[model samples]
Target: SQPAILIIGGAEDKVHGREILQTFWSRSGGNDAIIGIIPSASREPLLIGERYQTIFSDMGVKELKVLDIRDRAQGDDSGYRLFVEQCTGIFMTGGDQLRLCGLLADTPLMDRIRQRVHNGEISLAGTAAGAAVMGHHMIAGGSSGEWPNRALVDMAVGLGIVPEIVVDQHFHNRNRMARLLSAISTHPELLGLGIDEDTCAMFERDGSVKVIGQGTVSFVDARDMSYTNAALVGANAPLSLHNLRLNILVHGEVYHQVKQRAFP
Candidate 1:
């Protein structure tokens, strides 16, 4: 059995973030769950971690652990092993996605996180910075506006929790369609998931993703879209993206990508 991976765009445990946690609480079997917070992006200790602790406390979660691996020496092998081995759920706070990736990449801690999820011992949940690291390909940010150009974005290897998919946060609010479209144009083989703020895309063990919360999750598919080499050639060139399908899923709708269907 594998654990469910919850990828929230941003703003969790508060108004928008709380609803997402409530959804998880409803699904969880009232078991005593521990939340491990990886707040490496923050400069001060107890800042982001305490904020999450308060949210969990308000949600009636008594047992919570905050693992701030800011320094390399603090992220000891033994300490990292115990943290991931015992937690029921892991919540990654919003911060720099690159910082999060740098801390956990190729380390024993990351290996254990993957192993825990694979063994069904813990569910991995992240918002903003947290969500970006859950895919095979992630966007760190670039200078491309509304043009579909590959060089306008920078790609990085994620934690590999979700394969063949690129995760983008602050989707609609930030008008990140340009970058997402660029990513798809560069790699048509990968699925682009643009999650908006105060919203989330949860992937169950069955390989199905469900959209929940206030906003919508944009699923960009260029795999079947028709395209041709034409017109201008530059970063700001006007591009025509025809057959661009958009599925706006409200709360409680689950998307079965394997079957290519959405169910209420």
Candidate 2:
């Protein structure tokens, strides 16, 4: 009875991702369905919750509640409990991914968030920082323009809502392929999802993923690639790749890479 998980890269605030949010809202059965907003990651930025509140209100979400755990970490247990007990969907706002992980990692709240989703009481949706934390391995960052390498990366355990996958935001616009490719090279068993800005990857309870938005989500699979330069020490190393593929998915299409096919 676990809830569905929705991961969005960024641009969840205004006109771009409104339709996606609305889609979730409709699925939630209207405002009476309790929704919880976690602003813990953006606690330093006082305006973050207000901005999201305005947007949710505009979307006909009147039963919205905010759990602001800013400046105080000890209170998150109570906040997390409240969401687990009452919310129908939990939404994470854009902020520092590190902050979100730091606050929620290993806490009972984190466990309960997963439990609630597993129990089917709530749906989990993350945008920007939220999306990045859902992956098993996350890309912390480096020079915005540089290619990704081990030295330029920091690997951490994500929420595990989506397993064996690393999620990236602002994929093409931000040129995250280099970083994502670096992650896939490091962990070939992991699938990498590079979601474009203003788009989302919706994971149903049955393990199916659908891409929705104006931009595309690129998938990097290195399961069959051969590695030769084990001693390669830089990001510019020319590693040969085989069977690496890319897909540009739109609404109504399913990313059925498991079957080596796509469905409309």
Candidate 3:
């Protein structure tokens, strides 16, 4: 019952106190952790993979392995699956979300990892692109600095780790509020979560989310939305939505998704 999922908003501090990374390490079992780093989403897989390897190593983690699967063929590698089998925690490095899903979606390795994570057997943490793919509906790419419109954002299937939520990483730091809102317009049933740089939204097994690190986590909940012109509005046109609930949570805040509320 120690399972927890960490969705980081990219650029989390690697130096200094490293509160976020340390949280992941401590939840992963500390010295007894067998960690797996999946840098498949990264352009420089080995470089990114090794970068985290070093970080965790310095944290006193004894067993750490990087699964650098560049091609889909490598996703079927039994050796890679073996590592996943043994890992108590898995960290996904940042890159392109589309690339990350393209290489591993529906694969045996992904299924195994997903099952383990879903079953509360292993803790998973992902940053940036890694963070973006932790939902049923993913924001592939989008234009920023615009009003909420039909054409401001794009959506695709994700790893479905958090099936009821849409995660937008590098949120306010990159002016992605419009993008996240646009996505939520169509899928009002889902909760839209936006995380700022250097922050993390830790999902605990107790059905509560804890905020960690620097900045805040924003939530655009459409469950109470009264109306929206998303369907009537054409592409690139400013959309109209009424009665949407917006939440801005800072570090140490706890969000209860079921109750649709947060507390100190």
Candidate 4:
């Protein structure tokens, strides 16, 4: 289906605006869309989903439903599977990324979501920790802006909706640049996408990415690295990164991941 996968940074700032949110709605069916919210990452599932209900309702989204999948087994429940099958799109809220990945990874519901997304049956969206879990290789834990060191970063497997990239949320506000650098330094093959607060990195199925929000998206590329002793670096040691390329994108800018380039 070549669905539009929108991965938003936590806490989007929009005063009388809903560009990204509206775009998400269009993926489903606009006014006729059946939207589903997956709050697996949140501790208060119902409460979290309720917020989306109000928000989405305000945006004219009808028939919004919440998928109450507490445990891994819940993902296999026929009812939940039916809930997923009925919706045109599913959204995940922010909480603990590790929790989101651990419980849902490879589950029946997760499998269905992936298949739906892959076959372009539905579009998937995530925010905050939910955003962190979109990448195939998730950033489980880390501190940013210090230096390159695997000790400073923890990597895990996510829902794998977005592959070949490690995503970070609340980038600038949390000072996560150094942490993203650390993650990519150890894994030179994968690109690092650091999304700032209120920003969105919208990835199409074809690998073209568009930026939407008031903030920026930082892509950390280590493939052209000139020198690095990251493999030998120990805990708390400053990583040696040379020839590292950084691409910062804002709203209206488009980036081609496979081409490793950005355009206005």
lDDT, candidates in the order shown = 0.75, 0.72, 0.92, 0.84
Instruction: Specify the poorest-scoring 10-residue window by lDDT in model 2.
Output: 142-151
Q: State in Å the error of residue 95, model 3.
A: 0.9
Q: Mark the regions of model 2 whose C-alpha exceeds 4 Å error after superposition.
A: 1-3, 43-45, 76-80, 144-148, 226-238, 257-260
Predicted structure with the largest lDDT when compared to the true one: 3
Across 102-205, the per-residue lDDT of candidate 3 in tens digits comes to 99899989999999999999999999999999999999989897899978899999999999999999998999999999899979999999999999999998
Residue pairs clashing, model 3? none
lDDT of 2 by residue, 143-164 (tens): 3465555554566777777777
> In model 4, where is the ten-residue run with the lowest total lDDT?
12-21
User: How many residue pairs clash (N, CA or C atoms closer than 3 angstroms) in each of the candidate models, in the order given?
Assistant: 2, 2, 0, 5
| Winner of 3 and 4 under lDDT | 3
**Using Cα atoms with residue i matched to residue i, what is each candidate's TM-score against the true structure?**
0.88, 0.87, 0.98, 0.94
RMSD of each: 2.8, 2.7, 1.0, 1.8
Worst 10 residues of 3 by lDDT: 74-83
lDDT of 1 by residue, 168-229 (tens): 88887778878888777666777788898888998887768989888988888766777733
Shift in Å, residue 169, candidate 3: 0.9
Q: Return whichever of 1 and 4 wins on TM-score.
A: 4
The regions of model 3 sitting more than 4 angstroms off are none
**Distance (Å) between predicted and true CA of 208, model 4?**
0.9
